[PDB]
Symmetry: C2
Subunit: 435 residues, 2 copies
């Protein structure tokens, strides 16, 4: 039972060489909890993994199976990507984002992580006279910083907490007006906070990207997952909001991993502004041997990175997008379950002494979705994560996300089974009773 012995916890941390639990890597945190579950015979409420909790859509799976039987495993995918995937991604951009993006400029990638890597690789080499590459609108996804670091590309970042709405203009522009940046990246909906960039904010970002001639990489990993609206019906409003409505300098990264529960197949698509795709950048020639942005990215960089994405997986994604386009599959009907879980879980935290840290978009309360953030009496997250583990819960801090809200933890709603909800509530009660 709870709380778990303090000595046992120290011992298991020492075994893993963990000095500050708030900075432990995800694999070390997972190993710690797994070791504690075994040592104590308890099952933790594990809320730390931002991964799919739903099965892959049958349309995807069955298409891969059919295509493997037809012979695609022995055939290299086309240099520019599977034509069907490029075409359905183009249709998807129109039917779900209302953006006109040609199939030519829709590029299959090995997940949005390869999509981000190549975007940084090319976008941050567009202007050799600029000292920096990406401006990060954090809290964000730390692997993206590692990508830039691996590329040797300097970057800057700021925590969006104090700069929402019209306040975003002066803050973004403080960096862009140095003339030293090439790109901007953010996720919407956001990992880790679940904030959704408003149309006011997207207009500010787009206007400034055009003014300062920088490229916006918009990470739509949690596609259409702001459940306060319904973005799931093709060809009619509402549509997923996008910076593409406010600038021509954009790359829209679409992953299959979250909205299509397809993380294992490593397949995504970059939907690149058509005008950007054709734009001639002399500074790309030395390293890529292409002048046009899109050719440098797709024909040179991606080809060199992996010579395409898994052929069966390209078909799986094409089939899933087509089904959405055609009105035969509603992607939101399954993933909205995460929001239903969030509504329940948020209330358990708030009933037991917690507050939502990143709590609003404009005046709208935070959506119920895949993640939310919590704090407990402003205590440092390094202390709160220890308190979680003592009470058989696991979640991550925001310490490596660029957030300056040192009290914040990220709660994920995906894997925790509803059958463990009674245990989560009891544990939160016990945690709050200790105080």
């Amino acid at each position: 039972n709870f709380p778990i012995d303090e000595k046992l916890i120290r011992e298991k941390q020492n075994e893993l060489h963990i000095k500050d639990l708030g900075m432990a890597s995800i694999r070390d945190l997972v190993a710690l909890v797994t070791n504690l579950e075994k040592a104590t015979g308890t099952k933790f409420c594990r809320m730390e993994m931002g991964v799919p909790g739903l099965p892959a859509p049958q349309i995807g799976i069955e298409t891969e199976i059919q295509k493997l039987r037809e012979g695609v495993a022995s055939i290299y995918p086309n240099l520019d990507g599977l034509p069907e995937l490029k075409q359905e991604a183009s249709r998807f951009a129109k039917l779900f984002v209302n953006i006109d993006i040609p199939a030519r400029a829709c590029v299959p990638t090995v997940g949005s992580m390869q999509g981000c890597f190549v975007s940084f690789l090319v976008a941050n080499r567009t202007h050799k006279n600029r000292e920096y590459g990406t401006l990060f609108i954090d809290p964000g996804f730390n692997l993206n910083k590692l990508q830039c670091r691996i590329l040797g590309q300097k970057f800057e970042s700021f925590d969006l907490f104090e700069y929402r709405g019209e306040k975003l203009r002066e803050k973004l522009e403080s960096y862009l007006q140095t003339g030293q940046f090439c790109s901007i990246i953010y996720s919407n909906p956001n990992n880790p906070t679940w904030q959704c960039m408003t149309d006011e904010e997207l207009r500010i970002i787009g206007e400034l990207a055009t003014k300062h001639d920088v490229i916006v990489i918009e990470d739509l990993a949690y596609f259409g997952m702001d459940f306060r609206k319904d973005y799931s019906h093709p060809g009619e409003p509402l549509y997923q909001p996008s910076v593409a409505n406010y600038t021509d300098n954009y790359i829209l990264a679409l992953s299959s991993s979250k909205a299509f529960s397809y993380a294992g197949q490593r397949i995504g698509v970059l939907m690149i502004s058509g005008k950007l795709y054709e734009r001639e950048y002399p500074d790309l020639e030395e390293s890529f041997g292409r002048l046009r942005f899109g050719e440098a990215l797709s024909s040179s960089a991606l080809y060199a990175l992996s010579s395409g994405a898994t052929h069966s997986a390209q078909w799986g994604m094409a089939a899933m997008l087509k089904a959405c386009n055609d009105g035969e599959y509603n992607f939101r009907d399954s993933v909205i379950e995460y929001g239903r879980k969030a509504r329940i879980m948020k209330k358990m935290f708030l009933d037991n002494g917690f507050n939502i840290v990143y709590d609003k978009d404009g005046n709208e309360p935070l959506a119920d979705g895949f993640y939310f953030t919590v704090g407990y009496k402003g205590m440092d997250s390094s202390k709160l994560i220890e308190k979680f583990v003592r009470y058989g819960m696991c979640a991550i801090t925001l310490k490596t996300t660029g957030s300056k809200r040192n009290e914040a933890m990220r709660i994920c709603t995906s894997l925790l089974p509803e059958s463990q909800f009674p245990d989560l509530e009891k544990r939160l009660q016990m945690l709050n009773a200790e105080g």
Copy 2:
């Protein structure tokens, strides 16, 4: 069908339309586009020998395992950070049973084909000694995409054509570069794309010894694994085994693709089998850009994870099952792909009966194996002139001009896709070409 030779005006028009100035230097896309536009414009089918891609079906063991795993749920689960355990374990067993080398599962890293394996090997290996001016020394002729990878990474490289430096002559030639102290790595394919030459034991000992002496990492591209059909490397756990530099140095990365030996190119799956000692070796110069000190951790936990967060889960299962079946003696990979050698023997004879000579013709004193590729020349004619002659006679192949070869008379012939039903067409066309002379 219309008849040969094709009219020179027609060929000029279609080339001009594609903006091809020197056909011997045209990219593979433009060459392919030219031939398809000529086929369509003339009602003929060319004998297309230019594409170095599998011509056999993917093995059922791979396909069926992917199918089962997709049904079981792998599509919704990110692959483990270090790779699918089963693939790591089966690759380790494969190194032991087919190369006779002990490489732990920990150091066997799944990649999105060998092209991702090569990219990440350059990315990391060429950052191991910041005080060295160059990255890779290419033992060419080779795979031009590798040079583009170094170019993209901003890493200088050097290259030489192995033709004049075989056997003991390789030592002085390789050492002329390495003794400058400015290189980090060496790469070659064995069997080789484009020449089908296979590095001899004598040459592998030289490369390994020099790699140890000058502290450089050898990247051995085993894309055509076990495909020297002059020997039989297909029986697990008994000699002969696939020759490898791993017998002669601890500084090695073995790149194993599924694309050719397992006709699995579409699924973008391979494995780097990294020397265990190398995997654990600490390199201070990797920390700044990778945030790891050990070579293996910089490559797998940092670099590959940033590159794509793994390889397709079902594909990792497919390759694991194929390696396992080889390891367990249930599948023989050579029994399928030896078909390429059967075709090579026939095709070589057609070229040689019609005035050609084999350019890269021997490994030591042994005639070149019958396999996936071979090189031909025609009266020492420049390959930009010979490729024009091929096209006029309804044949397509590539020159060696973008491979690092200085044998400017050579063309690469691939035996993979050309259907046997077209063998008589190839023969007729070679007769006609030779008669013109």
